[PDB]
């Protein structure tokens, strides 16, 4: 999956 | 024009929100105009003294990881505040951050640098340039051109207002690898670039060609990041089992 993508959705 | 000033001010506002250690704060520390003095690391003995902040050079470089992961988080917060950014395709946002963060980290690194050294851990430390230069090769050669870049970049006297837009421009680079929809990226960038142009004209009215120097600095930063990436390739060729924060694994993946 993707950590950046989580930080983007936060 | 007016809307371009409104956008410039909005960006400065978010940059203030996103980035606790501003250029203004940093220059105040560096010129003793502030709040407790940074601890100076100038040799091995002061380094072990200041540790509350592998072979030494790898220890020093690997300790930058904590800061770089925070910076990524800050930069992500700032990117999300850029009008249009969150409406982009999500994988394209990731791409932009993946290939942007180090350019922005080196940009902000210059703010923490003067000809004699670099501030570390939110300004609580100051590592000297001579100390960094004494590290074993290839480490000892690496930072020198970073200081050179920083000294020239800082001579332009940009402030935080200027930097906020400069940074936005870099993040909205339509040429990152594997972007799926480039045009809406470029449309955002084009407008940012106009905000930057006006910003530079009003704020630095005696500064000939500043806008063009700044474009060239963006190219310099790509080059610096290319070099940063090759330092890690070179070192991975002998330091096989070297820890790496998972966030940074995502960023370095495929490079
Ligand atoms: C984080 C980039 C800015 C920076 N600040 C430094 C300071 C404040 C001191 C010494 C070197 C410094 N650097 C350069 C630096 C720092 C760490 C790392 C590199 C390059 C790239 O090469 C490496 C080679 C071997 C081991 C680690 C690394 C680095 C890594 C993994 C890294 N740490 O934070 C990153 O973003 N990358």
B37 Cβ contact list (under 8 Å, min separation 6): none
Contacts of B8 (CB under 8 A, 6+ apart): B161, B164, B165, B195, B198, B199
Sign of CA dihedral A9, B169, B96, B241: negative
Residues B67 and B108: beta-carbon distance below 8 Å:
no
Indicate the resolution in Å: 2.2
Q: Which residues in chain B are contacts of A4 at CB distance < 8 A?
A: 76, 93-94, 97-98, 247, 250-251
Q: Are B190 and B214 in contact (CB under 8 A)?
A: no
Beta bridge partners of B120: B125
Q: Other C-beta atoms within 10 Å of B214: how many? A: 20
The single-letter DSSP state of residue B37 is: P
Kindly state if the Cβ of B120 falls inside 6 Å of ligand 1.
yes
Reference B21, options B112, B116, B126, B157; nearest CA is B112
Separation CA B84–CA B128 (nearest Å): 41
Mind listing the domains of chain B with CATH numbers? Answer: 1-255 (1.10.565.10)
**Environment class of B232 (CB within 10 Å of its CB; exposed 0-12, middle 13-18, buried 19+):** middle
Q: Report long-range pairs for B50-54 (Cβ below 8 Å, ≥24 apart).
A: B50/B125, B53/B120, B53/B121, B53/B124, B53/B125
* DSSP letter assigned to residue B163: H
Top mutation candidate among B61, B108, B124 for ligand 1, by most atoms within 8 Å of CB: B61
Looking at ligand 1, which residue's alpha carbon is closest to its atom 11? Answer: B61
Q: What tokens were used for B197?
A: 């142009």
Place of tokens 């091995």: B44
d(CA B171, CA B39): 33
Please, are residues B80 and A8 in contact by the beta-carbon 8 Å criterion?
A: yes
Question: B150: helix, coil or strand?
Answer: helix
Dmax (CA) for chain A in angstroms is 15
The answer to whether the peptide bond before residue B138 is cis (omega within 30 degrees of 0) is yes
Residue B243 assigned to a binding site? no
Q: Measuring CA to CA, which residue among B153, B77, B86 is closest to residue B113?
A: B153
How was this structure obtained?
X-ray
């Amino acid at each position: 999956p993707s950590l950046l993508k989580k930080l983007l959705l936060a | 024009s007016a809307d371009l000033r409104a956008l410039a001010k909005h960006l400065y506002d978010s940059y203030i929100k996103s980035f606790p250690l501003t250029k203004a704060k940093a220059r105040a520390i560096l010129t003793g105009k502030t709040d407790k003095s940074p601890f100076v690391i100038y040799d091995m003995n002061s380094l072990m003294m200041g540790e509350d902040k592998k072979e030494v050079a790898i220890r020093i470089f690997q300790g930058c990881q904590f800061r770089s992961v925070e910076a990524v988080q800050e930069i992500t917060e700032y990117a999300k505040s850029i009008p249009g950014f969150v409406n982009l395709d999500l994988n394209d946002q990731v791409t932009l951050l993946k290939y942007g963060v180090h350019e922005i980290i080196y940009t902000m690194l210059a703010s923490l640098m003067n000809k004699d050294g670099v501030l570390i851990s939110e300004g609580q430390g100051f590592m000297t340039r001579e100390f960094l230069k004494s590290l074993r090769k290839p480490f000892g050669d690496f930072m020198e051109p970073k200081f050179e870049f920083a000294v020239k970049f800082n001579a332009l006297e940009l402030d935080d207002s200027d930097l906020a837009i400069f940074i936005a421009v870099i993040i909205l680079s339509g040429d990152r690898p594997g972007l799926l929809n480039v045009k809406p990226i470029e449309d955002i960038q084009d407008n940012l670039l106009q905000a930057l142009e006006l910003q530079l004209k009003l704020n630095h009215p005696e500064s000939s060609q500043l806008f063009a120097k700044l474009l060239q600095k963006m190219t310099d930063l790509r080059q610096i990041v290319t070099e940063h990436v090759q330092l890690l390739q070179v070192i991975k060729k002998t330091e096989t089992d070297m820890s790496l924060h998972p966030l940074l694994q995502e960023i370095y993946k495929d490079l």
